[PDB]
């Protein structure tokens, strides 16, 4: 009783844990009460309990600071009890740890400890380690003497001492600046999947020895460089406690024949000797490239050596081999057969949310000025990966140091703590770094959960509802589909003029469903045909299977028919290699994988009819140019972010813009916004967008869809009855 499993916390605070209400009732505590946590080796910690809607009933959520103090790791179990007899302290003595007090001097108490404890009312216990961040340094402290015992709350009227040499870290505790899970920004879902696969085989080997189940013995990670493939593998080893062994392709390959095989074998033998252990092989495609793509005996030999070592993992107890590559299909297929590397995780590229998380992680210690907006940075840093975002944070920090601190400090190794903490990093320093950095992953496809909601789409009221019926109902009400023997559709095709919201429709349903949106464009289908590389079709559908829940959006479905001539072409049909492979993958995709396929085309009259047969994109929705009421709705929606003057007549504009698409109505509103901003800035060298700004915007806006294009779409829609 009163025993919970240790997990990660959303709340970063050094004295807070989160419980689900049913365990708050079992412990007979209320929100805000102080509890005592009992871990391992007679080590305890004191904290405040709160609650949220994310913690499960069986688990207790805490940060790294509490886990280190309790000498526990993720997956362990501790005791929790209330302690309503906790009172305020009187005198405490807190000293820093030597591991962090390097290159820094001055009054550490006034810079770190006093802001940390003053009016903070934090529960402490003798021996508690806690981390105080600031001045671009992370300094951890230990409580070495308290008058009350063994715990107390530090009130603002208590006396805090800090005199003496820094404390040498004990072997029973780890540094809080070591790499852990809280250092990983985007790809949180991928990290969760790895945790489920790895934490138990290593943290609780007794479970797999006693229970008739097999552990994973190899996980392949892939994605562009700089996304965190090596960070995840190391963070997992650090969190679970397994010994981390580092291997990389090019180093092993740089060795002479016989040396490369011996070194690879030694790493596996050492992992067993130090089990539990993780073997991370970087650039797997370099150490073990496809045998059918090489020529020499030595290159095939090292592949055979790795393949047999992977099979040997059935004898090497508690050893998991992880690997990283850039492309999952650049390694010998034998490595991915049952056993060996039978699991893999697609890391990819972080999206706008993940990039913001990475920027926040690499600014933990940085003092930011009020003008700094990391969300704006994350939106501008398209094509950047964690390696680039980390560089941006460090570069912004350095610029702040050179502007201020170099006019205060000596050209030496040691800096006063007060001068460091007095420095703030401004938005100009981040923007400067953005001008110096260049994205390392700008061409690769990025898969993200979109932020588009239904309120972002003007008009199309029935189409929005139709998508919910097609996408949500098959899983929200599965008993009705079974009851009536109805087979849910696997996808829908949209047709009509460009710029009417086809993309928003697919994103909006992905948003509400919390699903990944995968954007596939015509140029990809065109390249596959001409380059005889239709194998990339499998990669597209495989990514959707791995990204599930997701919406797989195939734009420009007409590109295949156009590649065969489109308007002229030969005398045959639209069937070809690429569409045949796409249709095959569609037929082999089950609705039980939570993957929905949406297509779009601006030339529906030339789409291979095969894709419209039952089991494919059998549903057809026409998306015309917005009508009178829809155009007003579009103009209004685009202005929700800015004040609009009462003299602005949006219905008049909608009446004039009869031939405009939603994309063209957006330019009108956005241009009027820019014009109002221009005037506002000039007035200080205004509070709302005036009628003059919309009338001026109309001087530049034009319709993108001609009358002849409209008739083509209407005639097709009429043909379908």
């Amino acid at each position: 009783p009163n025993r919970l499993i240790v997990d990660e916390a959303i709340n970063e605070d050094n004295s807070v844990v989160s419980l689900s209400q049913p365990k708050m009732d079992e412990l007979q505590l209320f929100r805000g009460d102080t509890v005592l946590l009992k871990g391992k080796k007679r080590r305890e910690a004191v904290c405040i309990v709160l609650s949220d809607d994310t913690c499960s009933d069986e688990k207790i959520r805490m940060n790294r600071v509490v886990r280190n103090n309790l000498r526990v790791r993720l997956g362990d179990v501790i005791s929790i009890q209330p302690c309503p007899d906790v009172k305020y302290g009187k005198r405490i003595h807190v000293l820093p740890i030597d591991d962090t007090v390097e290159g820094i001097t001055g009054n550490l108490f006034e810079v770190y400890l006093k802001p940390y404890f003053l009016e903070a009312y934090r529960p402490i216990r003798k021996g508690d380690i806690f981390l105080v961040r600031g001045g671009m340094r992370a300094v951890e402290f230990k409580v070495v003497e308290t008058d009350p015992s063994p715990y107390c709350i530090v009130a603002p009227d208590t006396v805090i001492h800090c005199e003496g040499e820094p404390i040498k870290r004990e072997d029973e505790e780890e540094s809080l600046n070591e790499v852990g899970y809280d250092d990983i920004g985007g790809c949180r879902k991928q990290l969760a999947q790895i945790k489920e696969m790895v934490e138990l085989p290593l943290r609780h080997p007794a479970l797999f020895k006693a229970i008739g189940v097999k552990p994973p013995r190899g996980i392949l990670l892939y994605g562009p460089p700089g996304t965190g493939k090596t960070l995840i593998a190391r963070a997992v080893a650090n969190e679970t406690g397994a010994f981390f062994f580092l291997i990389n392709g090019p180093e092993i390959m740089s060795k002479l024949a016989g040396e490369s095989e011996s070194n690879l074998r030694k790493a596996f033998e050492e992992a067993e000797k130090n089990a539990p252990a993780i073997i991370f092989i970087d650039e797997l495609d370099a150490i073990a490239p496809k045998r059918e793509k090489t020529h020499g005996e030595v290159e095939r030999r090292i592949v055979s050596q790795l393949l047999t070592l992977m099979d040997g993992l059935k004898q090497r107890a508690h050893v998991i081999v992880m690997a990283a590559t850039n492309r999952p299909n650049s390694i010998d297929p034998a490595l991915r057969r049952f056993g060996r590397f039978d699991r893999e995780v697609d890391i990819g590229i972080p999206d706008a949310t993940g990039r913001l998380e990475i920027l926040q992680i690499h600014t933990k210690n940085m003092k930011l000025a009020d003008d700094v907006d990391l969300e704006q940075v994350a939106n501008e840093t398209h094509g950047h990966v964690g390696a680039d975002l980390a560089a941006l944070c460090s570069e912004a920090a350095l610029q702040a140091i050179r502007k201020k601190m170099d006019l205060i400090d000596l050209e030496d190794e040691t800096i006063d703590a007060e001068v460091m903490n007095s420095l703030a990093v401004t938005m100009d320093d981040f923007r400067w770094a953005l001008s110096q950095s260049n994205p390392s992953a700008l061409r690769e496809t990025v898969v993200e959960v979109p932020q588009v909601t239904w309120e972002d789409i003007g008009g199309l009221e029935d189409v929005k509802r139709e998508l919910q019926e097609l996408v949500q109902y098959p899983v929200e009400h599965p008993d009705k589909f079974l009851k009536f023997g109805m087979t849910p559709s696997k996808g829908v095709l949209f047709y009509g003029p460009p710029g009417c919201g086809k993309t928003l429709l697919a994103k909006a349903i992905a948003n509400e469903c919390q699903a990944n949106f995968i954007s596939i464009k015509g140029p990809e289908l065109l390249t596959m045909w001409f380059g005889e590389s239709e194998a990339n079709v499998r990669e597209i559908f495989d990514k959707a299977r791995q990204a599930a829940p997701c919406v797989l959006f195939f734009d420009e479905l007409d590109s295949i028919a156009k590649a065969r001539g489109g308007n002229i072409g030969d005398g045959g049909g639209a069937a070809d290699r690429v569409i045949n492979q796409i249709l095959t993958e569609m037929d082999g995709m089950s609705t039980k994988k939570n993957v929905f396929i949406i297509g779009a085309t601006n030339r529906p009259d030339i789409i291979d009819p095969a894709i419209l047969r039952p089991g494919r994109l059998d549903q057809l929705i026409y998306i015309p140019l917005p009508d009178e009421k829809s155009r007003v709705a579009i103009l209004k929606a685009n202005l929700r972010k800015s004040p609009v003057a009462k003299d602005v007549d949006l219905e008049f504009l909608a009446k004039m813009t009869n031939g405009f698409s939603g994309a063209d109505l957006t330019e009108i509103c956005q241009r009027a916004c820019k014009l109002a901003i221009r005037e506002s800035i000039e007035s200080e060298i205004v509070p709302e967008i005036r009628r003059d700004h919309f009338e001026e915007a109309m001087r530049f806006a034009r319709r993108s869809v001609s009358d002849n294009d409209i008739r083509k779409y209407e005639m097709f829609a009429q043909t379908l009855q």
Binding site: D13, D33, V86, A120, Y121
Partner: peptide, 20 residues
């Protein structure tokens, strides 16, 4: 008890100011 609820009020203020 009361000292624990005052400790919770301080922890909630720190978490809300940083996360909001």
């Amino acid at each position: 008890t009361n000292e624990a609820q005052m400790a919770a009020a301080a922890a909630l203020a720190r978490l809300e100011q940083k996360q909001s």
